[PDB]
Design an enzyme around this catalytic site. Structure first.
Site, PDB file in Angstrom:
ATOM      1  N   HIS A  61       0.860  -1.203   0.000  1.00 40.32           N
ATOM      2  CA  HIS A  61       0.000   0.000   0.000  1.00 40.32           C
ATOM      3  C   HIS A  61       0.898   1.257   0.000  1.00 40.32           C
ATOM      4  O   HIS A  61       1.611   1.508   0.976  1.00 40.32           O
ATOM      5  CB  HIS A  61      -0.950  -0.029   1.198  1.00 40.32           C
ATOM      6  CG  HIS A  61      -1.902   1.133   1.244  1.00 40.32           C
ATOM      7  ND1 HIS A  61      -2.872   1.365   0.286  1.00 40.32           N
ATOM      8  CD2 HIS A  61      -2.000   2.148   2.136  1.00 40.32           C
ATOM      9  CE1 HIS A  61      -3.539   2.475   0.611  1.00 40.32           C
ATOM     10  NE2 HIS A  61      -3.030   2.964   1.729  1.00 40.32           N
ATOM     11  N   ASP A  63       0.942   5.221  -0.175  1.00 41.19           N
ATOM     12  CA  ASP A  63       0.197   6.486  -0.125  1.00 41.19           C
ATOM     13  C   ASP A  63       0.913   7.604  -0.857  1.00 41.19           C
ATOM     14  O   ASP A  63       2.078   7.863  -0.545  1.00 41.19           O
ATOM     15  CB  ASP A  63       0.095   6.915   1.322  1.00 41.19           C
ATOM     16  CG  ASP A  63      -0.702   5.941   2.111  1.00 41.19           C
ATOM     17  OD1 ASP A  63      -1.925   5.802   1.829  1.00 41.19           O
ATOM     18  OD2 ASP A  63      -0.069   5.256   2.976  1.00 41.19           O
ATOM     19  N   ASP A 175      -7.997   1.072   1.656  1.00 44.28           N
ATOM     20  CA  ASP A 175      -7.780   2.077   2.696  1.00 44.28           C
ATOM     21  C   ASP A 175      -8.752   3.270   2.799  1.00 44.28           C
ATOM     22  O   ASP A 175      -8.758   3.897   3.852  1.00 44.28           O
ATOM     23  CB  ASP A 175      -6.319   2.576   2.674  1.00 44.28           C
ATOM     24  CG  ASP A 175      -5.763   2.920   4.077  1.00 44.28           C
ATOM     25  OD1 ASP A 175      -6.302   2.398   5.094  1.00 44.28           O
ATOM     26  OD2 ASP A 175      -4.754   3.680   4.144  1.00 44.28           O
ATOM     27  N   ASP A 312       1.504  -1.433   4.492  1.00 44.21           N
ATOM     28  CA  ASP A 312       1.930  -0.127   4.004  1.00 44.21           C
ATOM     29  C   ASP A 312       3.391  -0.139   3.623  1.00 44.21           C
ATOM     30  O   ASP A 312       4.250  -0.549   4.397  1.00 44.21           O
ATOM     31  CB  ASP A 312       1.657   0.924   5.068  1.00 44.21           C
ATOM     32  CG  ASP A 312       0.165   1.187   5.250  1.00 44.21           C
ATOM     33  OD1 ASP A 312      -0.660   0.469   4.629  1.00 44.21           O
ATOM     34  OD2 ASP A 312      -0.163   2.166   5.968  1.00 44.21           O
ATOM     35  N   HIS A 442      -6.717   9.419  -0.504  1.00 40.22           N
ATOM     36  CA  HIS A 442      -7.409   9.306   0.774  1.00 40.22           C
ATOM     37  C   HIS A 442      -6.639   9.901   1.960  1.00 40.22           C
ATOM     38  O   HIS A 442      -7.147   9.797   3.088  1.00 40.22           O
ATOM     39  CB  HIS A 442      -7.849   7.846   1.053  1.00 40.22           C
ATOM     40  CG  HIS A 442      -6.699   6.878   1.061  1.00 40.22           C
ATOM     41  ND1 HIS A 442      -6.241   6.238  -0.078  1.00 40.22           N
ATOM     42  CD2 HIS A 442      -5.893   6.459   2.076  1.00 40.22           C
ATOM     43  CE1 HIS A 442      -5.192   5.486   0.236  1.00 40.22           C
ATOM     44  NE2 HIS A 442      -4.979   5.582   1.537  1.00 40.22           N
TER      45      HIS A 442
END
Ligand SMILES: C[S@@](=O)[C@@H]1[C@@H](N)[C@@H](O)[C@@H](O)[C@H]1O
Ligand SMILES: [Zn+2]
Length: 1016
Positions: A61, A63, A175, A312, A442
């Site tokens: 994941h 971000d 997420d 993550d 997000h």
């Protein structure tokens, strides 16, 4: 023909409003699966002729900004993850990996040498590396507008098609903090066949798991037939991390995260570490793991099991790739060779999982339930509802909507022509789309990033706005200059944009004054753009250096205008009051602009030495005790003063509004003879708990119902004009303004929460509407969904996203509040609406951000307030899960989200100026929008292609007879059309070759995309 979206209640197995009404929500200890129960399975369920097929799907994941900026994470983490993924997948043919965030992938791939690009293409083509979703980001689903969800999806998928030659048909959203049906809506219209979600309320996971309804065909709430349905897999457990993805017991699953043995600085909080798989332990370890898998499999209907393997920013270190892969390979070899397990386990991709599920379905092994509704508001545990982020960092939430509109207008204005490469139009539009797309992440629009990351997003969006202005102003110059005179320099500024509401008065003095004078410049051209596909009138205002200005159109017809002072509000640390100061050097001129569909109109502002015939002047009344004078330079009308008192105003034939002595609305009277309907604005504050869990950027954990803001004796300014009137009041933390132009009022709040730590400021409306426990809020600006306040849930659970609007109604009366920015809100009692303005939080809320929210800055929030009689409207039945706006409320929403754009010519004389563009464009029915117009080809392409996204909303029928209107055929908006095709919404696949090159209009609540091709 078109499905009726109003009168037929869809029959679904699970309807989330109805489920909520029946469900318990009690938070009981379920054992090792803390929010579930002790899962039991029959060992004999699987056998030689019916094995459990297990797909372990490695993932990471990433971000695009959160605790670090996009670029910081790229340098520190993501570039290593992708580089090592390339190497390991290349060297290990059975290993698999899925990738979601195309912003990072594009950032990486463009830094690769050609040899590595080829290797990368080869692991994608052979199915080892699989893109899931393929959007620029994994967007927020609460605050994001559907148009920007589509934008970011298209940005990532266009990149993937061009460079990787793939288009994902499976979506992965692990997420976002709660989930919206706008996603399957857009995805199913973009070629998708499957999607996966994760963050849904723990009580919902338990309820659906018990019924094996975690996989379902998710259709829209109004969809009676089911043509919108998209197969959806909801993960069952608390997290997508490895402890919560192997099975119900995280103490066991954590032992199969091989990054947790010590050298990586990770450990298992359940206190049992992973152990390296060996021949002496593989049978025991396999027994433990298969048991977890078979328990998880009990929650689903087929013999195909999805086991995500990631977390993550995982799969970074080479040693990590090795430790996960080798240990899992040992487990697979043992498990698959031991018949007694009746398991076949392997690394897989997401599409592989879904393909196998549907093979099982086709074999008659399972049928899946149908579902409609949404998955807000999320709670991950106890009473920790994630409604805070509906409001966090509201300045940037508002900026999202401004940039949304600027991107649309820039793409549309520049689409009309092909541009030489030297104009850099494509470059500037790509940057603008990419920065706006990035913000849909997000942790972007949600306001859940660290302070310095919020600054990076803001800077990126500011550059995007500059890029849009550049493209728009060059486009206006080309569209409105005689072609044989047009002489562009592509670096020149022919116009500047004037925007009255962003950043907004008291936020930034960014607005240019038009400087006129007898000894310098007698007049100035201004141009308005209307991105909507119907003729539109709207009042527009400009700052001018004289009050004696008149307006003409470009047939030299006089246009009625009103001049008002320029008022700014100040917190006077001398007098300890918040009060307005009037400019003595600039003034506002206001007039009604009338602009063609998707077109432009030119006006001229001319100075004179005295009051012009067709310009009026507003009166001004300052209500406060102990007034002092307010001189206004040359302004012809003296300001009046009075003690605070109730007042009433009426512009045009519009409503009559009455205000309290504190300058807040008290009632609205729709017509001369009608009742004064109580509608009371109030500002309150929520605080934070001193005991137990603290509100932060994600969580809203109030210490009880809100308390009224103490207003004291605030200063109230009343401006009364023929075209526009207003009442403005300086309240603590908010300059609140009600503006009247002859229809539904506009509300503007300049919100500055200052140093009020641990405070959330809410704006509430109190009415006598008998709404009970029902209210309506929108999802992504696309649809309105019925909400029911539930007293079995805490206050923060009854908060929902208000991305563009909310309403309450009874049999006779509706009040709709439209917003120009996503905020959180609710109806906490019958007859009430409330919407949070800002929140300042001193503590972290324990989700990993590691800070509170203490970086507030002044923001101008905008709204329209629409009170309507609805007893004659044809509304859905009591059991229908949707609601629909009226024409007036929809137009009011459009006025906030897509206003006219205003351009001021930058030099003294515009040679070759033209009066109008687009007068021949069709003026489409009011419920239809051209959401996107985008030229898809550069100038060297022989066949030019232009893409259009058409969206038709559904407006309530209330007995206003329908007018005429022209058919809009987008395929004939540009000349020399050679082909018209219906496409997926991303424009990436042709679905239908259209007869006569005519693009049909779409049905209510439908969105379609068309591409027209033109010989050039
Ligand atoms: C809510 S935190 O778990 C979440 C993290 N998983 C990280 O990916 C970022 O999105 C953060 O908000
Ligand atoms: Zn995340």
């Amino acid at each position: 023909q078109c499905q009726d979206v109003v009168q037929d209640v869809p029959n679904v197995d699970v309807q989330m409003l109805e489920l909520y009404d029946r469900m318990s929500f009690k938070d009981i200890d379920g054992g090792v699966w803390k929010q579930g129960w002790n899962i039991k399975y029959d060992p004999l369920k699987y056998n030689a002729h019916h094995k459990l097929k297990v797909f372990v799907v490695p993932h990471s994941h990433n971000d695009p900004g959160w605790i670090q900026t996009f670029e910081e994470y790229y340098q520190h983490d993501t570039k290593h993850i992708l580089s090592n993924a390339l190497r390991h997948l290349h060297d290990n043919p059975e290993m698999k990996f899925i990738w979601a965030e195309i912003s990072y992938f594009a950032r990486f791939y463009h830094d690769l040498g050609e040899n590595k690009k080829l290797q990368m293409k080869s692991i994608v083509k052979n199915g080892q590396l699989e893109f899931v979703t393929g959007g620029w980001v994994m967007p927020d689903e609460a605050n994001s507008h559907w148009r920007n969800v589509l934008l970011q999806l298209t940005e990532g998928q266009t990149w993937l098609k061009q460079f990787m030659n793939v288009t994902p048909t499976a979506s992965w959203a692990i997420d976002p903090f709660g989930h919206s049906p706008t996603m399957p809506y857009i995805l199913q219209k973009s070629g998708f066949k499957n999607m996966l979600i994760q963050r849904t309320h723990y009580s919902v996971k338990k309820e659906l798991a018990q019924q094996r309804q975690l996989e379902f065909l998710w259709r829209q709430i109004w969809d009676n037939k089911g043509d919108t349905a998209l197969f959806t897999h909801m993960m069952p457990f608390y997290s997508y991390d490895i402890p919560h993805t192997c099975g119900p017991d995280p103490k066991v699953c954590c032992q199969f995260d091989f990054k947790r043995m010590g050298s990586f600085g990770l450990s298992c909080p359940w206190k049992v570490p992973p152990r390296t798989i060996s021949d002496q332990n593989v049978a025991a370890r396999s027994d433990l793991l298969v048991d977890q898998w078979k328990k998880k499999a009990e929650l689903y209907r087929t013999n195909v099991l999805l086991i995500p393997l990631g977390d993550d920013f995982r799969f970074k270190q080479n040693t990590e790739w090795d430790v996960q892969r080798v240990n899992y390979e040992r487990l697979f070899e043992h498990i698959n060779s031991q018949a007694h397990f009746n398991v076949q386990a392997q690394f897989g991709t997401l599409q592989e999982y879904f393909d196998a599920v549907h093979q099982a379905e086709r074999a008659g092994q399972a049928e899946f339930p149908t579902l409609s509704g949404d998955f807000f508001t999320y709670a991950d545990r106890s009473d920790n509802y994630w409604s805070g982020y509906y409001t966090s960092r509201p300045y940037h939430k508002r900026m999202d909507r401004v940039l949304m509109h600027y991107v649309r207008a820039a793409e549309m204005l520049s689409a009309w022509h092909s541009w030489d490469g030297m104009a850099r139009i494509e470059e500037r539009l790509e940057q603008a789309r990419r920065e706006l797309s990035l913000f849909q992440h997000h942790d972007g629009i949600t306001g859940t990033a660290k302070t310095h990351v919020v600054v990076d997003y803001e800077q990126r969006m500011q550059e995007a706005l500059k890029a849009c202005q550049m493209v728009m102003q060059q486009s206006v110059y080309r569209l409105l200059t005689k072609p044989s005179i047009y002489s562009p320099d592509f670096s020149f500024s022919y116009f500047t944009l004037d925007d009255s509401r962003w950043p907004g008065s008291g936020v930034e003095d960014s607005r240019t004054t038009i400087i006129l004078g007898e000894d310098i410049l007698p007049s100035k051209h201004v141009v308005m753009h209307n991105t909507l596909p119907h003729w539109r009138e709207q009042l527009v205002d400009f700052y001018v250096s004289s009050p004696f200005v008149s307006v003409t159109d470009l047939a030299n017809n006089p246009v009625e205008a009103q001049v008002s002072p320029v008022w700014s509000w100040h917190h006077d640390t001398l007098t300890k009051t918040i009060h307005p100061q009037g400019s003595t050097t600039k003034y506002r001129i206001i007039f009604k602009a009338r602009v063609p569909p998707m077109g432009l109109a030119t006006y001229v502002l001319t100075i004179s030495d005295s009051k012009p015939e067709h310009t009026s002047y507003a009166s001004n009344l300052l209500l406060r005790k102990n007034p002092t004078s307010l001189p206004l330079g040359q302004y012809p009308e003296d300001v009046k003063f009075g003690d605070p008192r109730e007042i009433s105003l009426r512009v045009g034939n519009g409503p009559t509004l009455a205000f309290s002595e504190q300058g807040l609305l008290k009632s609205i009277q729709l017509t001369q003879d009608s009742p004064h309907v109580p509608v009371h604005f109030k500002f309150l504050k929520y605080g934070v708990r001193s005991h137990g869990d603290r509100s932060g950027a994600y969580l809203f954990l109030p210490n009880g119902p809100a308390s009224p803001v103490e207003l004291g004796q605030p200063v109230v300014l009343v401006t009364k004009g023929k075209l526009e009137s207003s009442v403005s009041v300086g309240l603590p933390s908010v300059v609140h303004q009600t503006i009247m132009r002859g229809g539904a009022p506009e509300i503007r709040n300049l919100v500055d929460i200052g140093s009020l730590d641990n405070t959330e400021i809410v704006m509430r409306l109190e009415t006598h509407i008998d709404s009970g426990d029902i209210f309506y809020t929108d999802l992504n600006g696309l649809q309105f969904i019925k909400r029911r306040r539930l007293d079995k849930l805490p206050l923060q659970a009854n908060y929902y996203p208000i991305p563009s609007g909310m309403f309450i109604e009874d049999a006779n009366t509706r009040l709709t509040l439209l917003t120009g920015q996503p905020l959180g809100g609710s109806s906490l009692a019958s007859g009430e609406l409330e919407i949070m303005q800002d929140r300042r939080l001193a503590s972290d809320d324990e989700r990993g951000l590691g800070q509170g929210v203490l970086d507030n800055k002044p923001v101008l929030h905008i709204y329209r307030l629409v009170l309507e009689k609805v007893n004659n409207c044809v509304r859905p039945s009591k059991l229908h899960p949707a609601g629909y706006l009226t024409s007036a409320a929809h137009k009011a929403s459009q006025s906030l989200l897509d206003p006219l754009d205003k351009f001021i010519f930058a030099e003294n004389e515009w040679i070759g100026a033209q009066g109008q563009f687009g007068g021949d464009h069709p003026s489409a029915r009011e419920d239809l929008d051209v959401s996107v117009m985008r030229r898809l080809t550069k100038s060297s392409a022989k066949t030019q292609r232009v893409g259009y996204v058409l969206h038709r909303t559904n407006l309530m029928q209330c007995g206003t007879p329908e007018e005429h209107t022209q058919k809009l055929d987008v395929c004939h908006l540009l000349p020399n059309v050679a082909r018209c095709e219906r496409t997926t919404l991303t424009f990436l696949q042709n679905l239908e070759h259209l007869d006569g090159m005519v693009a049909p209009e779409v049905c209510p609540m439908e969105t379609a995309a068309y591409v027209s091709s033109h010989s050039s």
